[model samples]
Target chain A: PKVKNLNPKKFSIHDQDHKVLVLDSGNLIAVPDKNYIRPEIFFALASSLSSASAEKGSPILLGVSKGEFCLYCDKSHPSLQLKKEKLMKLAAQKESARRPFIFYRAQGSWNMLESAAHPGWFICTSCNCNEPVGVTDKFKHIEFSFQPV
Target chain B: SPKVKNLNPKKFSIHDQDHKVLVLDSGNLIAVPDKNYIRPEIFFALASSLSSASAEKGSPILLGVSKGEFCLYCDKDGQSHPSLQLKKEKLMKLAAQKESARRPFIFYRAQVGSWNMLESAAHPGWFICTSCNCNEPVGVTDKFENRKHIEFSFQPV
Candidate 1:
């Protein structure tokens, strides 16, 4: 486990700043592997901030979404992969704000999109792209990079 | 400040092996979040194991023959979100292997926590004439391509 130095001055209070929250001087207990970060940590951190800010009687703005990219098999062996161009359009929609934030696999890894910080984008285009199905006992990896918006 | 309850407590874990770890509740499947993986099983995997355990207790099995219809009610007041249930008459026939073998199956998220029930088999395929009303939370969606009651049909096969 790496120690996080607590320095409030470096924190980015923007709701969309996932990268800043993790990398900032403050720290929270997280049980993470090479693949995915737990949603509980997101909830806990947000909750902590909300509670801390409750003194002002105002809701703290925050952004969170989780999903997996899906590749559909078009009968037989033929399959339709989600094109990045298509996702780029859909990512910009307000609907992409939900959790289980899946992106249809395209190009190499979705992890490539970690640095992207906009309201509509649902996927981290720069992250790893391997995922397991129902029959296979496999887990996907989550590569993340937080940025201040 | 008034006490705030963390209603969204996730227990399911997704493992590196791709298997989902789910927390089984009475033969039903429960999904947990990605965090809290210091222990052995991931969230999704736990859920699959829990489903197997539920059948071992001699719970009534629902069989699917093609167009089987299962009713899942989203009970907000209950503990289990999107619980599984089947209509008594629509229950399909389970073969010796399907009945005995404890394999984890999939369920729909649109279903209810407790009000849901599996519709009995209609024979030929799993399709049915009647549909039960389903209540879902704001975040859930019928997006999974192979989901039952939405795209495909599931029953005791």
Candidate 2:
């Protein structure tokens, strides 16, 4: 088994300018196989961050959006359980921000949207195509980029 | 911080083999968004073998079947096909007890964990045994020990 480095600085998405701790840097954002990152990792990161920020007494800004050219499948993948869990957990927290996270769409251009309007829609960052994604669309799907505020 | 391990594309590449590895997550061997295509007998051999492999590694491999309904066996015992068929009726009832408002199938591990229960994003009221390949109403427990006695049953397409 190869050693998994959890340091955030080595990832391509690691940007000091963002001034945010990228928890997904190792396991989720930049995986060994670009074509297959589990969606559970996404929600897990979001949930963990929300839980942390809420406990710290300062709400962090979150950006949830997809880019063109989905590295995996060419569609939007939805995880109702994860989505609901994150939303509910964040909502129940008194220290969380008003809007814990915002959703975005990846068309020809990067456009920020809402998850309510588009239930199961996401953008393929590689091809810039919008597609439907299920809960466990683990392989061949678009990538979701997260930003910490 | 450490980097995530890079996977070898060769393992996941699909060739003209009887059984191909589609998704290998974390080397734990969990295959999600699984399909119901392989022959029943071949599936048993592979599934049972993988179950043991996952146990040895302590990283249980989970098999997920979506858009299709199927059951698995815990005990490959003296109960002939007739007895297994009768158990299917009970399994069907189990499948409906916790329907996830969506469609999917059973997941097996060497020893079922809490996360092994059936869940769906779109539906509700459906559940499956994580240890055995039986579908029973949600809250109904399979009396078999660690699902030692089981079989597979699928709804006709």
Candidate 3:
């Protein structure tokens, strides 16, 4: 309805320099690993728009449990909320709770996921590896890539 | 060339939510670090859905627990107050069943790292959980919490 753009093939959450998102010790941290299990780090998108395609800067929910659980920010915290959901069971209710914290926009050459709830806060990996994927107000050029399922 | 690891083609050792590997003892499944653990074998190739079958880590196939043959199944038609034990059935007979009949043993991966999560295909929201301290029968619940019995690890042996 909002000119959606979610894709069918799952993508990875890595930033510039190719540091990938890892779910290590109950955390989403960035790390450098060339040979890796694609299923473990790659993420699939799920949103209100049943439209199975996405454009740059689309309102979306990033998921790990094959679109069952969405990756949401705890807000102002460095942790990610692995909430069990399909990003609002139904868009009809105009949900407001977790919706605010989980929605993001896939943008830029590196494919950084910018948070819709917190403007300027991109779903970022710290400058160093193994750090929590928190948001930053700073606008920096980062890069990421996608893969086929 | 980036390729996917098709887990459906191998036999895997199933671990508990956090600690211990799931082993069968006296016809019951339990997780513990010991020798002679019967590494769990996976069955039933799941049909594709909204998510790619590759992301599934080869689950949502088939398995169960009715006690008659200990077959675990997803009860889509019913709900129980406490624990909803699956109905009774035989494994050999299940080979001739349909997709709906195979959904119980089916599981999906939460992720593939040092640990993994085995969630129900029949009950998409519910996860197949194990023990925290140790020594208990595995069960399914909707609550996904850390420091609790909610996560599992997988290694194809």
Each model's DockQ score? 0.03, 0.01, 0.01
- Label model 3 with its docking quality class: incorrect
lDDT of candidate 2 at residue A94, scale 0 to 100: 49
Off-target runs (Cα >4 Å) in candidate 1 are A1-127, A130-149, B1-19, B23-157
Error of 3 at B116 (Å): 26
Give the fraction of reference interface contacts each candidate recovers: 0.00, 0.00, 0.00
Best by DockQ: 1
Model 1 has an lDDT value of: 0.23
Chain B TM-score list for all models: 0.19, 0.18, 0.58
Model 1 Cα lDDT, one tens digit per residue, A12-96: 2111213211211122222222222222122101111212223222111122221122122221222223222222223333532
True contacts kept of 2: 0.00
Off by over 4 Å in 2: A1-29, A32-37, A41-86, A92-149, B1-157
Q: Give the TM-score of candidate 1.
A: 0.17
Q: What RMSD does each model have against the real structure?
A: 21.4, 21.6, 19.3
What TM-score does each of the candidates earn?
Answer: 0.17, 0.17, 0.40
Per-residue lDDT of B102 in model 1:
19
